[PDB]
Amino acid sequence: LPLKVLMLGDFTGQEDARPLEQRAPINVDKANFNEVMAQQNLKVTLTAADKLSADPNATMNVSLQFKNLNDFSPESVVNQVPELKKLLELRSALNALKGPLGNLPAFRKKLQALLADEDGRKALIKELGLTEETK
Amino acid sequence: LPLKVLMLGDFTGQEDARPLEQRAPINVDKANFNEVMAQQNLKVTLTAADKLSADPNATMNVSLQFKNLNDFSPESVVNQVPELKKLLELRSALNALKGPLGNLPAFRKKLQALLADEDGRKALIKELGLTEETK
Amino acid sequence: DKALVDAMIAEIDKRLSSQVNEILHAKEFQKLESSWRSLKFMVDRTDFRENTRVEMLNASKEDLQKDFEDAPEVTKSGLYKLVYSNEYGVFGGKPYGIISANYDFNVGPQDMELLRKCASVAAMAHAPFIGNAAPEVFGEESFLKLPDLKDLKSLFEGPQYARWHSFRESEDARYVGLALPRFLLRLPYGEKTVPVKAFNFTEDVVGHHERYLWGHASVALTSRVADSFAKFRWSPNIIGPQSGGAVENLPLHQYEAMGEIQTKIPTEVMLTERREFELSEEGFIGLVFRKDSDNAAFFSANSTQKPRFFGNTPEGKAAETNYRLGTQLPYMFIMTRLAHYIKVLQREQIGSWKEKSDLERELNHWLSQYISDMDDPAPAVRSRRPLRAARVVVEDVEGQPGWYRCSLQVRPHFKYMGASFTLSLVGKLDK
Amino acid sequence: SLKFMVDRTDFRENTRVEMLNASKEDLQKDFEDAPEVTKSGLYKLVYSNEYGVFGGKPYGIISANYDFNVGPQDMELLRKCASVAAMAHAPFIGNAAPEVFGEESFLKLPDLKDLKSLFEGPQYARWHSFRESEDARYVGLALPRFLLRLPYGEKTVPVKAFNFTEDVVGHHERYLWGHASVALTSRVADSFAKFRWS
Amino acid sequence: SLKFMVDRTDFRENTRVEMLNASKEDLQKDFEDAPEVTKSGLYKLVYSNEYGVFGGKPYGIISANYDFNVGPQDMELLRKCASVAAMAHAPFIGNAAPE
Amino acid sequence: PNIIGPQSGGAVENLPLHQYEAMGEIQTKIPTEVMLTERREFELSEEGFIGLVFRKDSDNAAFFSANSTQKPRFFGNTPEGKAAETNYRLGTQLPYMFI
């Protein structure tokens, strides 16, 4: 007789409509753990304090999705949050410029692409443009 | 020989017209208790002090109906009392607004729907509108 | 800004909660709820797989009197019809074990008359009638003033209890049993202890404990009968913390006191041993609360009937012993089941070739089935075999061939129900 | 915490685990909804689909990823889990919340002068009765949590591109604490992996 | 003197102590006021709330922080404390005054 | 029961001391008002008092016995009479009443 354990817990961001007797158990092992997460489909709709500005009334709502544990890394969090993703794109633009990897014409073309995102606040665009060296 | 008990009592809000010898007993068990309540059909027509205002002469008459024991919960009491149900709808409108889950245009549209109920007193509508933030 | 919106929510729920308290604390509302909630509390603590059954019969006390007063005799009452006639007195049917009435009784003449009729019914079909007593029966506003009563025995001397005193002397009183204080059914609504959906409701119990959803103790006693039967198919094990008269898992409610914390007692009061004993003497079934727990117990189940006193002689004391056994429900339940078995099994035998001594032989072999006449039967095993000894005599109905007169006398095992101890220090005691 | 469990087991040693998504609230919903435990949804695929099925297999143990308080709902949930565990002969393991000891977090355990005296209060009336039940043998609760992740750092735990340095404030709740019940579950797995007994 | 007592005990060994503020004068007041000892205030939470309560616990002993003279009031107080102690099987200990 | 002896557990240890000038010498204020002699202790015991005696030149005191207030009864000097006296005397002493 195998030793089978049953792990019961809130693995999702929400309760299911399906009755307890109807929802089914999932067999997990080392060779399909990630596959289980991908199939389970994880999602978080939550609001955090917007600290990209200086307003106490500013709030940020995010919709994160996970397929594997790697999707909980700050790198994936940024990629799924446009308000941070654009700032990371800005970061890459400024490091490229400062290391002389691109000329001014390419820099200005890429900058406009970054700041074109209609989901950005104008307050954030201003803080991003304020990081650009005068030259 | 089974051990059968007879529970005699006032299970309804009113006496029956049917003679005692004519009205029939109901067999109850764990697998039909709720079904028995649903079939029995419970109703309460009663008046309580109206404490939604500041008038000693204000009284509230309610007509509650029960199908199961869950229908005695405050959640079902509110749902069957328009004078409270509208206040709960108001509650949900204000929490949605304060958590920024809906914009001002939707808020005002929903507010008018809530307060449109012709069974509401104008005194209650005024107390409900007084809870709306100025903005 | 949102802080002000939250304050609006606080005041909104404050007002909504003030109104909801009115409905939840409505006497009409609580009468309905407590009836059905107390009913399920009974039902779900039974086991229907153990041949336990329950039926509901909607009737008010007023209409009980209406029917019994309307009828020319009890044998023609509506209640008699489907307690006795449709059950015990029907070939192929089944007898009602017991009747649980969800009522409170006062000393009022109507209430006393109702008890008289229920005693007669119960006697005719060999099943006890259990209910509860109202607070005002003891001339107090609620059960919370039981501690203030200096002497119940003297209280019942007043002219006010003239009818109740006569009732206790009737031979039918053996089939009545009334319980004392009520008990909590529901813990008050709270964001933590008993939350509701959406609406942030916090029930506010005032100074009046009547705001609490009190339940009829008669149901708790009915679960005692059910458990004893479920285990043994007999109902004598209902009078002890360990015997099976213990009521476990009572609602608790911790709240602020004078700067400290205390829990609302599951029963209105914390009955002392002396006060319980006083109530027992006055033929009440007091559900006592085990201090600092969620457990209560029925120390005894005396019927309404008052014991008779006899001359202090060998025969006189034997008369007292026999009469006292009759006055207690734990022993009457044995006779009730015996009466039900005899009625059924004997109807099957009608038409058979039975001479006088044939009945004595067969009846003797039958009764032995429930006898445990060993030197020392395992304690509480005696439970499945309640009897220790029994005697049967059969005579002939002279001038009526085929008819017999049978006498059945039984000696049940005794319940431990009190003792006096004499302590003494001593030198040169035998080792 | 689930993977932390999973990857410390050995599936070649006849060890198996299943996941069943359920919140504490809906556990109570099901157990209160059902007329009896034998008809609960959880009973159905712990007992009925396993131990009580010819050709099937019995569940070894149940690990619940929950924190319990002294709250009446939590106590009732434990009562039902004790009954389930008793019927199919498998223990129910979980964790206790900090507030169970009347403290804000486990970091004030050193300040508690006497736990035995603390549990005398009326607040723990139901918990005290629970410990006396014959079903209590199939309940096991763990105390303090434990770290799952070391805070992000350019050296100790670097990320790509973005030079992220996680800043844990004064509140240790910023740390990714994990349910100790999993750590206890790995103990059961190791004993079984070596001996086929726990 | 109370702490001197308290800190020389061991509460881990199932030892408990309660304080009940009462003067000798009011002890007599209560015992004289009551029709019988069974209805005295002291009887109520020595015997009634303890020894005579299902689920409760009995008081081991009573320590009274008093000095007694040969005075009739003091003798009557001792009489009542003897009766209480007898009913709930716990001794009453106190002190005697020099006089 | 172990409350009536220097070794049995009726010993009171660690009493306050106070050395002060006498008639040109030094002496300590006795922890108890007096230094009770064996004869005087025994006298007090006969009168049903519990005398805490002071161990001379130390900070230790002891309760040699814990007789109650009750006075022992005398019986006829016979086998049965002396047995009655034995039994009654056991009742009069607290070390046995605690049992």
Automatic annotation (TrEMBL), chains A, B:
It comes from the Bacteria. This is Type VI secretion system-associated protein. It comes from Myxococcus xanthus (strain DK1622). The lineage of its organism: Bacteria, Pseudomonadati, Myxococcota, Myxococcia, Myxococcales.
UniProtKB/TrEMBL annotation, chain F:
Signal peptide: none annotated. This is Type VI secretion protein. The chain holds residues 298 to 396 of 494 of the full protein.
